[PDB]
Amino acid sequence: TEIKKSVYNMVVKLGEFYNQMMVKAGLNDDMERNLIQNAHAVERILLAATDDKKHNKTGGTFYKMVRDDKTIYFSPIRITFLKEEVKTMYKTTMGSDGFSGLNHIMIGHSQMNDVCFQRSKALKRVGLDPSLISTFAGSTIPRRSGATGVAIKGGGTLVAEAIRFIGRAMADRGLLRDIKAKTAYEKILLNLKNKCSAPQQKALVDQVIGSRNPGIADIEDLTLLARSMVVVRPSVASKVVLPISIYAKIPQLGFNVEEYSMVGYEAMALYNMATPVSILRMGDDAKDKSQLFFMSCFGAAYEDLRVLSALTGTEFKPRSALKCKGFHVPAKEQVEGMGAALMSIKLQFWAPMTRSGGNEVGGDGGSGQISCSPVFAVERPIALSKQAVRRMLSMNIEGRDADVKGNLLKMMNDSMAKKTSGNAFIGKKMFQISDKNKTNPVEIQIKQTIPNFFFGRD
Amino acid sequence: PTEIKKSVYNMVVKLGEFYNQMMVKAGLNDDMERNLIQNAHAVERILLAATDDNKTGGTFYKMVRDDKTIYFSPIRITFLKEEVKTMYKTTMGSDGFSGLNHIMIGHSQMNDVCFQRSKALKRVGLDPSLISTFAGSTIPRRSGATGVAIKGGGTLVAEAIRFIGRAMADRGLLRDIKAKTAYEKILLNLKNKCSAPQQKALVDQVIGSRNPGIADIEDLTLLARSMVVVRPSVASKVVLPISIYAKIPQLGFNVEEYSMVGYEAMALYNMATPVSILRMGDDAKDKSQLFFMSCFGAAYEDLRVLSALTGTEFKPRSALKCKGFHVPAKEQVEGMGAALMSIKLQFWAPMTRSGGNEVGGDGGSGQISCSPVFAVERPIALSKQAVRRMLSMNIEGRDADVKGNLLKMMNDSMAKKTSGNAFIGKKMFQISDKNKTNPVEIQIKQTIPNFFFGRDT
Amino acid sequence: TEIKKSVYNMVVKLGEFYNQMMVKAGLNDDMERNLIQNAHAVERILLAATDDKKHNKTGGTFYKMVRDDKTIYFSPIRITFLKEEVKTMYKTTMGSDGFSGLNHIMIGHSQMNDVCFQRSKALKRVGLDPSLISTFAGSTIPRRSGATGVAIKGGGTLVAEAIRFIGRAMADRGLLRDIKAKTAYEKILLNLKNKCSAPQQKALVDQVIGSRNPGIADIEDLTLLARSMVVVRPSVASKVVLPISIYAKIPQLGFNVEEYSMVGYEAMALYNMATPVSILRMGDDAKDKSQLFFMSCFGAAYEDLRVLSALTGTEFKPRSALKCKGFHVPAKEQVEGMGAALMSIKLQFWAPMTRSGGNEVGGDGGSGQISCSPVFAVERPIALSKQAVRRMLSMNIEGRDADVKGNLLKMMNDSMAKKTSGNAFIGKKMFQISDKNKTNPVEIQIKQTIPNFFFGRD
Amino acid sequence: PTEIKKSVYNMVVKLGEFYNQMMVKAGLNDDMERNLIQNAHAVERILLAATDDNKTGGTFYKMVRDDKTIYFSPIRITFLKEEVKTMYKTTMGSDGFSGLNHIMIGHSQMNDVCFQRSKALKRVGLDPSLISTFAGSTIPRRSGATGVAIKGGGTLVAEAIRFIGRAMADRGLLRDIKAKTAYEKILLNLKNKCSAPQQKALVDQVIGSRNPGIADIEDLTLLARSMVVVRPSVASKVVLPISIYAKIPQLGFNVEEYSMVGYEAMALYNMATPVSILRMGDDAKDKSQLFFMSCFGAAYEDLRVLSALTGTEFKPRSALKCKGFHVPAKEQVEGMGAALMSIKLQFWAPMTRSGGNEVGGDGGSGQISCSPVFAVERPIALSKQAVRRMLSMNIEGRDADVKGNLLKMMNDSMAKKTSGNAFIGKKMFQISDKNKTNPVEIQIKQTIPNFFFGRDT
């Protein structure tokens, strides 16, 4: 209700900061203001200046606009700022929204990294399968984000962190006696299982909690848990975070009431009405480049490419098919007058993004009457619900305790053993960027010819 | 003598005769008052209460009407628990017990329909589902072995679990020998209603344990679940308010015989012209469905089978809009709403005491296979289900694996792609058709929700 | 080849004995000669006289022919013979065929008892399920029959005898030290498993042999074996044995070469061309009475009623449906001039009876190539044999030993888990009583509306 | 360089060039003699024998003919194992090894067809079936790692079992380190051809055991069976007698390139005009089938797929009436029967190195699932087989249960009612059609027996 009004000012101020921030740099012309590289630049110089590191001036690579007339080009700058100047400049304009502002931006960077980086190597060190990456969302986010940052973390990310802890704790066992890292550890386990939906997944992590002395036996349980999160996906916060270069243009777009939703339409409309432009290295198909940016903003890296393609009306391609590199231009290649292009993929349609990093619906109808007791004697089909009884046998009635790994494993087999059923989210329809309040459902479909997995290979 | 229809007849008639003199005592005489089921309900409460360990009374209804239409007002009179019992036993005679048990069975059947016992299921540790196996959990122990008839599998498993629990907290009843055999009779009553060998075996293990260890409660829970797959035997009977039984002489004849499991009751229901008090927001149609289900104990029965016989579409307890038949003091007003219960039977089928599921059970117990003599081709006659009786049920064996047997039983029945039929060959007959001389081939309404208490979908 | 010629004289002589035997009794008129009761009578007086019992004169109930003109009637006699007179009289006419003769008759009595008696009570003492009766064939046959008698014994019969032994051996353990009953016991185990076809059934009984000290653990194995013999039936000898009253008429039928087969056509033709007549008690439908007799002669008690009905062209009914009592008329009811009737069920068709008390054919094709190894790359069904691999996993490769009860149990489940397949004996066709040498196959079918099990109930 | 077709070309041509000078040495010059595959077989024996550790020779055939028709007579000449080897290496050059290995691979492929190895399978403890996994068990170790290519799963499991057995009877080869790593390379070669995770895992357990206990042989046997369900990778190549390779220059051209796995070999087979000596009771047709199967290593291949490509009906080894291509001394006569091998290809498909079964294996190894962002309906993209790779195959786990994993794998594939397809989308092309520009949609001959060595039915 009034929360949107709160979030609105939060993002607007971030934009204001970007404006005055670029003004310091001496970058004015809109070609520079809208460049997402310049955004990332001040976003680095900011986050760095607001965090103790260990001179004492943080710089970054910026891009100016060289005319040459004809077409347009950009050149690398790399100026420097002063941490304290930036630190005060930020808090002044930000005010009480200072903290949530930094957390926002960081959630953006993490959502962009999930897209622009395959973390499978990091997945091998704690190692689970190089797959399961879909559960590894938000593994690059700093500890600073706190409870708000852990909200975007995938089930696999927490499992990785937990395992990491349990391992270092076996070497130096004084970590359990710390009470500081001890609570941090216990909270990881309490964070996970908050995201976990399925009871069998809760039971497991619960068992992991029940052990006062962590050991390899727990790592086995967590690994088996991480894998079950692919069949039954945990709840990860999915939010729209855009470079502050766009937030800066909120006033200049000029048509608004006062309110904003990063979980909803407000951000959707803002993305389209914006005019982001990015730098391009060698190769770098502008169309694919735009795809990365879209997925970034929407943290759609692990989302179904089919669902995206339906909303944007354009074809999304797996990372393999996509020809282009990351948004950050490495020092190795930086030249004068390198090309740039808008991010061209807009939303023909839209849907509210909801919590729930994943959802499996059509779940067995239960807790109600699951069967019938015949009274009249007459021939009849014998109504019964199969998927429901496999729920009882598999899940934890009250008593006797149980064998967890078994039920958690059985829950996975029983999931794949029913016909073929992919229906979830049912009842939810896609809408149109012109439609607010969702008065007109779009009934058509999602494309079945496109590969589902962005990182899918082989 | 299979003339019992005659005896059962005298049983319901005397009940109705009592209802009449009870109403007359209350000072309410008219068809609108008599046919009103609330007055019947009230009279039944004053009865059951007066026959059980100063003076009591229920809330009755008198008929006050705008010139065009009829309305009712709450009364709540009272009389002595003695005159009530004496008046009852006098007129009732040797059928007094059978009468109380009958009426009592009715209240339970209605109760299962009107109320959601999914709560009490949790209290005993059982799942929220399985409610279909929970039939007759509100019925007093007064009904005795005749009452347990309407008791479902879950109900007994529940009664056992709660006892085993009370035995752990407090020992001292084994040695008691009263509640000890009382506990065992529950296990014997169970397995009587259990069809599948695995189940009758799983209860055996529980019986064979002198001390109720963890292995017992562990089994009972698995047994509870299995009863939702292979359904136990719950006696199903047609019970109507004595206000209807009072009109039997006025409705004329019957055959002079009456059967609550047969066609006699089927006709009596349709012939009857019952009226129920309507509360606020009560849909007469939906309300009439509850009365239908309450009379036939149709609660856990398939709604499709019900939608057929009645020729109308039965709604789930969720979509169904109405409240219980009893009027809470919180809402009671002068001259409130009332309506006739409009749902009747187009067709009828016998009331089954079984859970029958898919036929061909027990394996036949006779010769299960053939040992060839002549050499020539032929399709190997064998009974596949008859062996699962011998393997699961142990004669000289134990194996301790009984749990795994039940599990494998359910899972295998789960394996069949789509398979089921119940009472195959049993046909429905028009309410005008008795003697079952003209079966009708109509099938049922595949578009209608199956379970009355089904939800979450 | 020449064996038939040997069996021919064997049966003929038995008939000759019956003739001269009845002559002693003073029973001449054909109405008496053809009576199967009179046959049974001298068959009792014979078997009794040829076996040491412990006065010293064996009698029996016989039936004379009272005229009354009009219709015909029979009356009970009960004369007596002398064992030694009968004993010498038999060996004289019998000669070298003496022994095989007694064994034959005994195989007949046992085949009639299987039909006319439900042994389920005897099945409960050793007790297995009251079903399994189909494997209990030939449980009434005396020890005298030896190896020839044990040939008609069902798998259940041996299992019963074995269990009986193991039990009495646990009470008095000196039975193992006897070396007499010890070999008798060991031979029971070696007899069984000779009848057993399936390897899993051999493995089990083998394990039972491997135990020097018999115990309850073995009884469990044998019980589980007995039950598996219903799914996979052992091999029991099925022979045609007729009352010697009919054998006596072999010369009087008058059309023969010299040879006979109780396993084949010769006996088939003899049954039909005969004219047996039996006594009838109260009730006793003559049609059903004939059915018992037919089944008796052919030891068809456990055979499929459908298969019988096809050959005889008449409807066979389960014992429950059949209205009539046993052939033996108890002392309690014996009167003067009680009714009699022919046994009227003949063979419209015939088939050679073969060993194999039971057969399950269509067995998984194996020991040959069970699968394919692709060379060319092209789309194709992927030919494979499912029922064959369940054979390997279930049965005993060489090494490691194994868990027998498991494989023996799995073999049963795997048998019922394949579609529905009842085809066995395939390729074998029924023939006609006029056809010898089987030159003309009968192609039509067996009736599917008739109950299969004679003793089937509930 | 994927120009290798050029190299392989020079390899077979030189082989043929050797066959020519070998025949010339034998003094037999004519097309009837040259095209005769028996003379090719003989020359190959004198070669393989001369290249392996005084003088040797095979039984050759000279052409003697009635004026109307052609006949052949046995010869059996001999020369020095030295001149043979020198003559061979001179003309063969750097391809000498590849040449010997090629010819050697041929003999094995033919061997699998002509002979029943179901015996040797018993000697190693394996089932009589699984013969389809026994491919290339007669091939010498001389062929090295290139030879193991044609070796089947069972063949390796057999080689392992026999070693483990010889290690038990006699220790002393672990410490040997020669036959020790030689044993291990068999386990590594295995699991390379194994597709399913459960299998590659089951062999891992065997490798991880320093001492070959009972757990090993126990697994290998289970592994052997599993290869009849999920078929390992056996390299399939087209090998023809050098007598055909000698006509390559006369047949003209080719492209100047040659590939034994490709179309080049397909054409060469049909272009070739091979003749085989016929023994008594030999059906020319049936005999021609053996030659076809021997060349394409079609032995364990589906006969239906074979019946299609050739446009003729392939009979099983049972119904098929004929004997091996080699003439035993017991039956050899002057001027005996001979016939052209008449079975050709109407269509052709590439030679696959796989066992492919049903596609969609390995799970993809990439992103296996989707984590939703927008709220809206969509069919839950997930890879069911990709998880069975993670569950069965353990990264940080062991569980010791690997045996149960294989079992459950097979049983689940057994569960599907009727399901299979191989190389779905792969089409057969006319022998006139190269470049695969015109796929044909014809299906295959469902009335024909599947397995060549199938029996008992």
Side-chain angles (χ1 to χ4, degrees), chain B residues 251-265:
Chain B
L251 293 163
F253 56 99
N254 266 90
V255 180
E256 178 60 23
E257 310 172 5
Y258 183 73
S259 172
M260 59 187 64
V261 66
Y263 174 89
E264 289 75 10

PDB file of all heavy atoms in Angstrom, chain B residues 251-265:
ATOM      1  N   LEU B 251     -48.931 -43.028   5.913  1.00  0.00           N
ATOM      2  CA  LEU B 251     -48.497 -43.273   4.542  1.00  0.00           C
ATOM      3  C   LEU B 251     -49.143 -44.554   4.042  1.00  0.00           C
ATOM      4  O   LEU B 251     -49.107 -44.867   2.856  1.00  0.00           O
ATOM      5  CB  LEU B 251     -46.975 -43.391   4.476  1.00  0.00           C
ATOM      6  CG  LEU B 251     -46.189 -42.114   4.773  1.00  0.00           C
ATOM      7  CD1 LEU B 251     -44.739 -42.428   5.098  1.00  0.00           C
ATOM      8  CD2 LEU B 251     -46.287 -41.143   3.605  1.00  0.00           C
ATOM      9  N   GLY B 252     -49.713 -45.302   4.977  1.00  0.00           N
ATOM     10  CA  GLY B 252     -50.425 -46.523   4.665  1.00  0.00           C
ATOM     11  C   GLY B 252     -49.472 -47.695   4.567  1.00  0.00           C
ATOM     12  O   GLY B 252     -48.309 -47.530   4.195  1.00  0.00           O
ATOM     13  N   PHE B 253     -49.967 -48.873   4.930  1.00  0.00           N
ATOM     14  CA  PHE B 253     -49.304 -50.154   4.699  1.00  0.00           C
ATOM     15  C   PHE B 253     -47.819 -50.091   5.047  1.00  0.00           C
ATOM     16  O   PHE B 253     -47.386 -49.226   5.809  1.00  0.00           O
ATOM     17  CB  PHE B 253     -49.433 -50.480   3.199  1.00  0.00           C
ATOM     18  CG  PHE B 253     -48.888 -49.387   2.287  1.00  0.00           C
ATOM     19  CD1 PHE B 253     -47.625 -49.491   1.736  1.00  0.00           C
ATOM     20  CD2 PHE B 253     -49.637 -48.258   1.990  1.00  0.00           C
ATOM     21  CE1 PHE B 253     -47.110 -48.500   0.920  1.00  0.00           C
ATOM     22  CE2 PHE B 253     -49.118 -47.253   1.187  1.00  0.00           C
ATOM     23  CZ  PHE B 253     -47.856 -47.382   0.646  1.00  0.00           C
ATOM     24  N   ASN B 254     -47.043 -51.024   4.496  1.00  0.00           N
ATOM     25  CA  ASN B 254     -45.862 -50.749   3.694  1.00  0.00           C
ATOM     26  C   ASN B 254     -45.817 -51.853   2.640  1.00  0.00           C
ATOM     27  O   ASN B 254     -46.252 -51.682   1.502  1.00  0.00           O
ATOM     28  CB  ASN B 254     -44.597 -50.707   4.544  1.00  0.00           C
ATOM     29  CG  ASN B 254     -44.252 -49.300   4.988  1.00  0.00           C
ATOM     30  OD1 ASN B 254     -44.685 -48.845   6.046  1.00  0.00           O
ATOM     31  ND2 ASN B 254     -43.479 -48.597   4.169  1.00  0.00           N
ATOM     32  N   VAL B 255     -45.270 -52.997   3.042  1.00  0.00           N
ATOM     33  CA  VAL B 255     -45.780 -54.314   2.688  1.00  0.00           C
ATOM     34  C   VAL B 255     -46.401 -54.878   3.967  1.00  0.00           C
ATOM     35  O   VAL B 255     -46.969 -55.972   3.977  1.00  0.00           O
ATOM     36  CB  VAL B 255     -44.671 -55.244   2.160  1.00  0.00           C
ATOM     37  CG1 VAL B 255     -45.244 -56.606   1.795  1.00  0.00           C
ATOM     38  CG2 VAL B 255     -43.988 -54.614   0.955  1.00  0.00           C
ATOM     39  N   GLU B 256     -46.287 -54.089   5.036  1.00  0.00           N
ATOM     40  CA  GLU B 256     -46.350 -54.557   6.424  1.00  0.00           C
ATOM     41  C   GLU B 256     -44.947 -54.974   6.886  1.00  0.00           C
ATOM     42  O   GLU B 256     -44.722 -55.263   8.064  1.00  0.00           O
ATOM     43  CB  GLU B 256     -47.354 -55.702   6.602  1.00  0.00           C
ATOM     44  CG  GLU B 256     -47.422 -56.268   8.017  1.00  0.00           C
ATOM     45  CD  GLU B 256     -47.836 -55.232   9.048  1.00  0.00           C
ATOM     46  OE1 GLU B 256     -48.470 -54.228   8.663  1.00  0.00           O
ATOM     47  OE2 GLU B 256     -47.525 -55.422  10.243  1.00  0.00           O
ATOM     48  N   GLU B 257     -44.006 -54.983   5.945  1.00  0.00           N
ATOM     49  CA  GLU B 257     -42.608 -55.289   6.231  1.00  0.00           C
ATOM     50  C   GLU B 257     -41.751 -54.044   6.021  1.00  0.00           C
ATOM     51  O   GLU B 257     -42.095 -53.179   5.215  1.00  0.00           O
ATOM     52  CB  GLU B 257     -42.107 -56.405   5.311  1.00  0.00           C
ATOM     53  CG  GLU B 257     -42.998 -57.635   5.254  1.00  0.00           C
ATOM     54  CD  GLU B 257     -42.560 -58.615   4.181  1.00  0.00           C
ATOM     55  OE1 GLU B 257     -41.506 -58.377   3.553  1.00  0.00           O
ATOM     56  OE2 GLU B 257     -43.267 -59.621   3.961  1.00  0.00           O
ATOM     57  N   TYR B 258     -40.638 -53.949   6.743  1.00  0.00           N
ATOM     58  CA  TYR B 258     -39.704 -52.843   6.543  1.00  0.00           C
ATOM     59  C   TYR B 258     -38.242 -53.257   6.692  1.00  0.00           C
ATOM     60  O   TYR B 258     -37.886 -54.011   7.595  1.00  0.00           O
ATOM     61  CB  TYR B 258     -40.020 -51.679   7.484  1.00  0.00           C
ATOM     62  CG  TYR B 258     -39.123 -50.481   7.273  1.00  0.00           C
ATOM     63  CD1 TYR B 258     -39.274 -49.667   6.159  1.00  0.00           C
ATOM     64  CD2 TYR B 258     -38.127 -50.164   8.186  1.00  0.00           C
ATOM     65  CE1 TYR B 258     -38.458 -48.572   5.957  1.00  0.00           C
ATOM     66  CE2 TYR B 258     -37.306 -49.069   7.993  1.00  0.00           C
ATOM     67  CZ  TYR B 258     -37.476 -48.277   6.876  1.00  0.00           C
ATOM     68  OH  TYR B 258     -36.665 -47.184   6.674  1.00  0.00           O
ATOM     69  N   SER B 259     -37.399 -52.749   5.797  1.00  0.00           N
ATOM     70  CA  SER B 259     -35.963 -53.005   5.845  1.00  0.00           C
ATOM     71  C   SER B 259     -35.177 -51.719   5.616  1.00  0.00           C
ATOM     72  O   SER B 259     -35.394 -51.021   4.626  1.00  0.00           O
ATOM     73  CB  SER B 259     -35.567 -54.044   4.798  1.00  0.00           C
ATOM     74  OG  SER B 259     -34.158 -54.166   4.720  1.00  0.00           O
ATOM     75  N   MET B 260     -34.261 -51.409   6.528  1.00  0.00           N
ATOM     76  CA  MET B 260     -33.489 -50.173   6.437  1.00  0.00           C
ATOM     77  C   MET B 260     -32.336 -50.285   5.442  1.00  0.00           C
ATOM     78  O   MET B 260     -31.791 -49.277   4.994  1.00  0.00           O
ATOM     79  CB  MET B 260     -32.974 -49.751   7.815  1.00  0.00           C
ATOM     80  CG  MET B 260     -32.090 -50.780   8.497  1.00  0.00           C
ATOM     81  SD  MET B 260     -31.680 -50.323  10.194  1.00  0.00           S
ATOM     82  CE  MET B 260     -33.298 -50.358  10.960  1.00  0.00           C
ATOM     83  N   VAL B 261     -31.955 -51.512   5.110  1.00  0.00           N
ATOM     84  CA  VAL B 261     -30.909 -51.736   4.121  1.00  0.00           C
ATOM     85  C   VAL B 261     -31.492 -51.938   2.719  1.00  0.00           C
ATOM     86  O   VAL B 261     -30.762 -51.946   1.725  1.00  0.00           O
ATOM     87  CB  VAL B 261     -30.030 -52.947   4.506  1.00  0.00           C
ATOM     88  CG1 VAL B 261     -30.838 -54.236   4.443  1.00  0.00           C
ATOM     89  CG2 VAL B 261     -28.806 -53.033   3.609  1.00  0.00           C
ATOM     90  N   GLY B 262     -32.812 -52.083   2.643  1.00  0.00           N
ATOM     91  CA  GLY B 262     -33.465 -52.441   1.396  1.00  0.00           C
ATOM     92  C   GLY B 262     -34.272 -51.356   0.705  1.00  0.00           C
ATOM     93  O   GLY B 262     -34.074 -50.162   0.934  1.00  0.00           O
ATOM     94  N   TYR B 263     -35.191 -51.790  -0.153  1.00  0.00           N
ATOM     95  CA  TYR B 263     -36.045 -50.884  -0.910  1.00  0.00           C
ATOM     96  C   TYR B 263     -37.089 -50.207  -0.027  1.00  0.00           C
ATOM     97  O   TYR B 263     -37.466 -49.061  -0.268  1.00  0.00           O
ATOM     98  CB  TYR B 263     -36.728 -51.634  -2.059  1.00  0.00           C
ATOM     99  CG  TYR B 263     -37.752 -50.810  -2.806  1.00  0.00           C
ATOM    100  CD1 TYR B 263     -37.386 -50.033  -3.896  1.00  0.00           C
ATOM    101  CD2 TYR B 263     -39.085 -50.808  -2.418  1.00  0.00           C
ATOM    102  CE1 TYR B 263     -38.320 -49.278  -4.579  1.00  0.00           C
ATOM    103  CE2 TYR B 263     -40.025 -50.057  -3.092  1.00  0.00           C
ATOM    104  CZ  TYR B 263     -39.638 -49.293  -4.173  1.00  0.00           C
ATOM    105  OH  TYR B 263     -40.574 -48.542  -4.848  1.00  0.00           O
ATOM    106  N   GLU B 264     -37.556 -50.918   0.994  1.00  0.00           N
ATOM    107  CA  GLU B 264     -38.565 -50.378   1.900  1.00  0.00           C
ATOM    108  C   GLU B 264     -38.178 -48.991   2.415  1.00  0.00           C
ATOM    109  O   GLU B 264     -39.011 -48.085   2.466  1.00  0.00           O
ATOM    110  CB  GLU B 264     -38.814 -51.331   3.072  1.00  0.00           C
ATOM    111  CG  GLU B 264     -39.556 -52.608   2.699  1.00  0.00           C
ATOM    112  CD  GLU B 264     -38.682 -53.612   1.971  1.00  0.00           C
ATOM    113  OE1 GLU B 264     -37.450 -53.410   1.924  1.00  0.00           O
ATOM    114  OE2 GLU B 264     -39.227 -54.608   1.450  1.00  0.00           O
ATOM    115  N   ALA B 265     -36.913 -48.830   2.791  1.00  0.00           N
ATOM    116  CA  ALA B 265     -36.415 -47.550   3.283  1.00  0.00           C
ATOM    117  C   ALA B 265     -36.281 -46.544   2.146  1.00  0.00           C
ATOM    118  O   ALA B 265     -36.497 -45.345   2.335  1.00  0.00           O
ATOM    119  CB  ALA B 265     -35.084 -47.733   3.989  1.00  0.00           C
TER     120      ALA B 265
END
